[PDB]
Amino acid sequence: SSATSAFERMENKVLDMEATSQAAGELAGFGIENQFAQLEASSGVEDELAALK
Amino acid sequence: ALFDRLGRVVRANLNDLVSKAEDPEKVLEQAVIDMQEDLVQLRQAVARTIAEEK
Amino acid sequence: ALFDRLGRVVRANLNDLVSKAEDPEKVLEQAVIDMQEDLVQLRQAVARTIAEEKRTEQRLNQDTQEAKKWEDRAKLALTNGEENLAREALARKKSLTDTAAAYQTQL
Amino acid sequence: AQQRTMSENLRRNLAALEAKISEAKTKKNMLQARAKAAKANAELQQTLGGLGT
């Protein structure tokens, strides 16, 4: 019946969506991290080559 | 006993008929497809429970 | 589960028919085209979340510089001898600082 | 004497209400950003994955 009663109700719905979306990511899994490591090493190999220049 | 027998007979004739309509290659393919859709919904079901954990 | 068996079969026949209509070249080509258009829309969606990063930096900067102007006003108010006017400026300055703190956390 | 005391109680309660409504207003601006982010994460998960027909 009050303005607060509906605002606070809306806030919880936004937070539930935030939690649900991240959880979907958690259970999907990620491959970004092991690819990122390949990029870091990939840099290291050519850092020596850069150093000669 | 008596009605119980006849009601089994009705089921049994239907059971044979549907098994004939089950081709093995197509039915197998379709079942794997169903299971994959089901798996996605189940992953989301777990995710919405994990949401309240957070 | 006699119903299930039938419901499996009806769907399987439909799937078999769909895979006849699947040509190899054209469904494959269309698939890349669909992905390309959808990806661009997603980049647009992401960009407006990445906008909020920049905006929250602006909001915080702003309100921490209203907080300074209250101090600037307050130093003069103290000198001129109006203690009450000075306290109001300082009080206003505090909750701008509280607001500013909240922004960093969010940011 | 009743008027002056009464006026203060009204005056004080209203100021407290302004702070509450200001907080809501403050929440609303950043809360929308959470909703946008939560939506954006969901789409990324679906596009990267997606299984079945």
PDB file of N, CA and C in Angstrom, chain C residues 23-69:
ATOM      1  N   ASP C  23      19.682 -27.738 -45.680  1.00  0.00           N
ATOM      2  CA  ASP C  23      20.576 -27.901 -46.804  1.00  0.00           C
ATOM      3  C   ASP C  23      21.895 -27.800 -46.072  1.00  0.00           C
ATOM      4  N   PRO C  24      23.013 -28.090 -46.719  1.00  0.00           N
ATOM      5  CA  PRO C  24      24.261 -27.997 -45.973  1.00  0.00           C
ATOM      6  C   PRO C  24      24.874 -26.618 -46.052  1.00  0.00           C
ATOM      7  N   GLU C  25      25.037 -26.037 -47.262  1.00  0.00           N
ATOM      8  CA  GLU C  25      25.657 -24.747 -47.481  1.00  0.00           C
ATOM      9  C   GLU C  25      24.924 -23.594 -46.837  1.00  0.00           C
ATOM     10  N   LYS C  26      23.582 -23.545 -46.981  1.00  0.00           N
ATOM     11  CA  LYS C  26      22.849 -22.315 -46.790  1.00  0.00           C
ATOM     12  C   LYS C  26      22.480 -22.099 -45.354  1.00  0.00           C
ATOM     13  N   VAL C  27      22.124 -23.184 -44.620  1.00  0.00           N
ATOM     14  CA  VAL C  27      21.844 -23.149 -43.199  1.00  0.00           C
ATOM     15  C   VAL C  27      23.100 -22.779 -42.438  1.00  0.00           C
ATOM     16  N   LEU C  28      24.262 -23.322 -42.877  1.00  0.00           N
ATOM     17  CA  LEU C  28      25.578 -23.015 -42.366  1.00  0.00           C
ATOM     18  C   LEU C  28      25.971 -21.556 -42.557  1.00  0.00           C
ATOM     19  N   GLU C  29      25.751 -20.979 -43.770  1.00  0.00           N
ATOM     20  CA  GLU C  29      26.014 -19.580 -44.091  1.00  0.00           C
ATOM     21  C   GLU C  29      25.188 -18.635 -43.252  1.00  0.00           C
ATOM     22  N   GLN C  30      23.866 -18.922 -43.140  1.00  0.00           N
ATOM     23  CA  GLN C  30      22.885 -18.165 -42.388  1.00  0.00           C
ATOM     24  C   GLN C  30      23.232 -18.131 -40.926  1.00  0.00           C
ATOM     25  N   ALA C  31      23.783 -19.252 -40.398  1.00  0.00           N
ATOM     26  CA  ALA C  31      24.205 -19.373 -39.027  1.00  0.00           C
ATOM     27  C   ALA C  31      25.263 -18.373 -38.623  1.00  0.00           C
ATOM     28  N   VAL C  32      26.301 -18.145 -39.471  1.00  0.00           N
ATOM     29  CA  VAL C  32      27.310 -17.118 -39.276  1.00  0.00           C
ATOM     30  C   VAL C  32      26.714 -15.723 -39.332  1.00  0.00           C
ATOM     31  N   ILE C  33      25.796 -15.460 -40.295  1.00  0.00           N
ATOM     32  CA  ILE C  33      25.116 -14.185 -40.461  1.00  0.00           C
ATOM     33  C   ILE C  33      24.296 -13.814 -39.246  1.00  0.00           C
ATOM     34  N   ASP C  34      23.517 -14.777 -38.682  1.00  0.00           N
ATOM     35  CA  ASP C  34      22.759 -14.624 -37.453  1.00  0.00           C
ATOM     36  C   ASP C  34      23.694 -14.247 -36.308  1.00  0.00           C
ATOM     37  N   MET C  35      24.830 -14.983 -36.124  1.00  0.00           N
ATOM     38  CA  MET C  35      25.809 -14.746 -35.069  1.00  0.00           C
ATOM     39  C   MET C  35      26.415 -13.369 -35.121  1.00  0.00           C
ATOM     40  N   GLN C  36      26.766 -12.895 -36.340  1.00  0.00           N
ATOM     41  CA  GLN C  36      27.358 -11.600 -36.583  1.00  0.00           C
ATOM     42  C   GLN C  36      26.459 -10.458 -36.161  1.00  0.00           C
ATOM     43  N   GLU C  37      25.150 -10.522 -36.508  1.00  0.00           N
ATOM     44  CA  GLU C  37      24.162  -9.521 -36.152  1.00  0.00           C
ATOM     45  C   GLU C  37      23.878  -9.501 -34.660  1.00  0.00           C
ATOM     46  N   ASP C  38      23.685 -10.692 -34.031  1.00  0.00           N
ATOM     47  CA  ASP C  38      23.408 -10.875 -32.610  1.00  0.00           C
ATOM     48  C   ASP C  38      24.554 -10.361 -31.743  1.00  0.00           C
ATOM     49  N   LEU C  39      25.826 -10.639 -32.135  1.00  0.00           N
ATOM     50  CA  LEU C  39      27.043 -10.220 -31.456  1.00  0.00           C
ATOM     51  C   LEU C  39      27.156  -8.714 -31.352  1.00  0.00           C
ATOM     52  N   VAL C  40      26.824  -7.984 -32.445  1.00  0.00           N
ATOM     53  CA  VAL C  40      26.815  -6.534 -32.504  1.00  0.00           C
ATOM     54  C   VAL C  40      25.815  -5.954 -31.531  1.00  0.00           C
ATOM     55  N   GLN C  41      24.596  -6.548 -31.427  1.00  0.00           N
ATOM     56  CA  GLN C  41      23.584  -6.140 -30.469  1.00  0.00           C
ATOM     57  C   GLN C  41      24.065  -6.304 -29.047  1.00  0.00           C
ATOM     58  N   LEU C  42      24.740  -7.436 -28.743  1.00  0.00           N
ATOM     59  CA  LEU C  42      25.338  -7.705 -27.452  1.00  0.00           C
ATOM     60  C   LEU C  42      26.421  -6.705 -27.087  1.00  0.00           C
ATOM     61  N   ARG C  43      27.294  -6.293 -28.050  1.00  0.00           N
ATOM     62  CA  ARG C  43      28.316  -5.266 -27.863  1.00  0.00           C
ATOM     63  C   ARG C  43      27.670  -3.953 -27.469  1.00  0.00           C
ATOM     64  N   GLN C  44      26.530  -3.583 -28.116  1.00  0.00           N
ATOM     65  CA  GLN C  44      25.732  -2.430 -27.751  1.00  0.00           C
ATOM     66  C   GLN C  44      25.197  -2.476 -26.328  1.00  0.00           C
ATOM     67  N   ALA C  45      24.667  -3.643 -25.875  1.00  0.00           N
ATOM     68  CA  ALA C  45      24.190  -3.850 -24.516  1.00  0.00           C
ATOM     69  C   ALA C  45      25.282  -3.701 -23.475  1.00  0.00           C
ATOM     70  N   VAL C  46      26.466  -4.322 -23.712  1.00  0.00           N
ATOM     71  CA  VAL C  46      27.652  -4.254 -22.874  1.00  0.00           C
ATOM     72  C   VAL C  46      28.170  -2.836 -22.756  1.00  0.00           C
ATOM     73  N   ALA C  47      28.200  -2.070 -23.878  1.00  0.00           N
ATOM     74  CA  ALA C  47      28.668  -0.697 -23.954  1.00  0.00           C
ATOM     75  C   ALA C  47      27.923   0.226 -23.018  1.00  0.00           C
ATOM     76  N   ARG C  48      26.587   0.046 -22.856  1.00  0.00           N
ATOM     77  CA  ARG C  48      25.790   0.862 -21.958  1.00  0.00           C
ATOM     78  C   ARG C  48      25.940   0.495 -20.497  1.00  0.00           C
ATOM     79  N   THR C  49      26.531  -0.681 -20.173  1.00  0.00           N
ATOM     80  CA  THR C  49      26.913  -1.025 -18.815  1.00  0.00           C
ATOM     81  C   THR C  49      28.278  -0.425 -18.548  1.00  0.00           C
ATOM     82  N   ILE C  50      29.163  -0.391 -19.579  1.00  0.00           N
ATOM     83  CA  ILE C  50      30.506   0.154 -19.497  1.00  0.00           C
ATOM     84  C   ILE C  50      30.464   1.669 -19.467  1.00  0.00           C
ATOM     85  N   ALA C  51      29.341   2.277 -19.912  1.00  0.00           N
ATOM     86  CA  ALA C  51      29.027   3.672 -19.714  1.00  0.00           C
ATOM     87  C   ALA C  51      28.925   4.043 -18.237  1.00  0.00           C
ATOM     88  N   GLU C  52      28.270   3.193 -17.396  1.00  0.00           N
ATOM     89  CA  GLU C  52      28.030   3.412 -15.970  1.00  0.00           C
ATOM     90  C   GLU C  52      29.308   3.519 -15.181  1.00  0.00           C
ATOM     91  N   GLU C  53      30.387   2.806 -15.603  1.00  0.00           N
ATOM     92  CA  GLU C  53      31.723   2.921 -15.049  1.00  0.00           C
ATOM     93  C   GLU C  53      32.205   4.367 -15.097  1.00  0.00           C
ATOM     94  N   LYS C  54      32.145   5.006 -16.296  1.00  0.00           N
ATOM     95  CA  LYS C  54      32.543   6.383 -16.545  1.00  0.00           C
ATOM     96  C   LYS C  54      31.672   7.369 -15.802  1.00  0.00           C
ATOM     97  N   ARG C  55      30.337   7.147 -15.818  1.00  0.00           N
ATOM     98  CA  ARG C  55      29.355   7.987 -15.169  1.00  0.00           C
ATOM     99  C   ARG C  55      29.521   8.049 -13.673  1.00  0.00           C
ATOM    100  N   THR C  56      29.842   6.911 -13.009  1.00  0.00           N
ATOM    101  CA  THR C  56      29.981   6.861 -11.566  1.00  0.00           C
ATOM    102  C   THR C  56      31.233   7.587 -11.118  1.00  0.00           C
ATOM    103  N   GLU C  57      32.307   7.601 -11.953  1.00  0.00           N
ATOM    104  CA  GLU C  57      33.466   8.452 -11.740  1.00  0.00           C
ATOM    105  C   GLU C  57      33.066   9.926 -11.733  1.00  0.00           C
ATOM    106  N   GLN C  58      32.209  10.372 -12.698  1.00  0.00           N
ATOM    107  CA  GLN C  58      31.690  11.734 -12.771  1.00  0.00           C
ATOM    108  C   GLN C  58      30.895  12.129 -11.545  1.00  0.00           C
ATOM    109  N   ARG C  59      29.936  11.271 -11.094  1.00  0.00           N
ATOM    110  CA  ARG C  59      29.036  11.539  -9.981  1.00  0.00           C
ATOM    111  C   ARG C  59      29.777  11.810  -8.696  1.00  0.00           C
ATOM    112  N   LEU C  60      30.776  10.959  -8.393  1.00  0.00           N
ATOM    113  CA  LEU C  60      31.646  11.075  -7.248  1.00  0.00           C
ATOM    114  C   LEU C  60      32.502  12.306  -7.255  1.00  0.00           C
ATOM    115  N   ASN C  61      33.103  12.607  -8.403  1.00  0.00           N
ATOM    116  CA  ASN C  61      33.963  13.775  -8.529  1.00  0.00           C
ATOM    117  C   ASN C  61      33.142  15.008  -8.205  1.00  0.00           C
ATOM    118  N   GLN C  62      32.022  15.142  -8.905  1.00  0.00           N
ATOM    119  CA  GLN C  62      31.112  16.256  -8.688  1.00  0.00           C
ATOM    120  C   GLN C  62      30.851  16.547  -7.240  1.00  0.00           C
ATOM    121  N   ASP C  63      30.369  15.530  -6.476  1.00  0.00           N
ATOM    122  CA  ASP C  63      29.758  15.742  -5.174  1.00  0.00           C
ATOM    123  C   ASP C  63      30.837  15.978  -4.137  1.00  0.00           C
ATOM    124  N   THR C  64      32.071  15.461  -4.381  1.00  0.00           N
ATOM    125  CA  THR C  64      33.228  15.717  -3.544  1.00  0.00           C
ATOM    126  C   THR C  64      33.734  17.135  -3.757  1.00  0.00           C
ATOM    127  N   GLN C  65      33.309  17.823  -4.849  1.00  0.00           N
ATOM    128  CA  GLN C  65      33.705  19.183  -5.135  1.00  0.00           C
ATOM    129  C   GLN C  65      32.647  20.188  -4.739  1.00  0.00           C
ATOM    130  N   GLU C  66      31.367  19.778  -4.537  1.00  0.00           N
ATOM    131  CA  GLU C  66      30.393  20.531  -3.757  1.00  0.00           C
ATOM    132  C   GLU C  66      30.807  20.596  -2.315  1.00  0.00           C
ATOM    133  N   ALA C  67      31.342  19.467  -1.777  1.00  0.00           N
ATOM    134  CA  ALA C  67      31.844  19.360  -0.422  1.00  0.00           C
ATOM    135  C   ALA C  67      32.936  20.378  -0.127  1.00  0.00           C
ATOM    136  N   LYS C  68      33.882  20.610  -1.083  1.00  0.00           N
ATOM    137  CA  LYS C  68      34.895  21.656  -1.013  1.00  0.00           C
ATOM    138  C   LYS C  68      34.288  23.030  -0.958  1.00  0.00           C
ATOM    139  N   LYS C  69      33.281  23.323  -1.812  1.00  0.00           N
ATOM    140  CA  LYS C  69      32.652  24.628  -1.869  1.00  0.00           C
ATOM    141  C   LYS C  69      31.948  25.005  -0.591  1.00  0.00           C
TER     142      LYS C  69
END
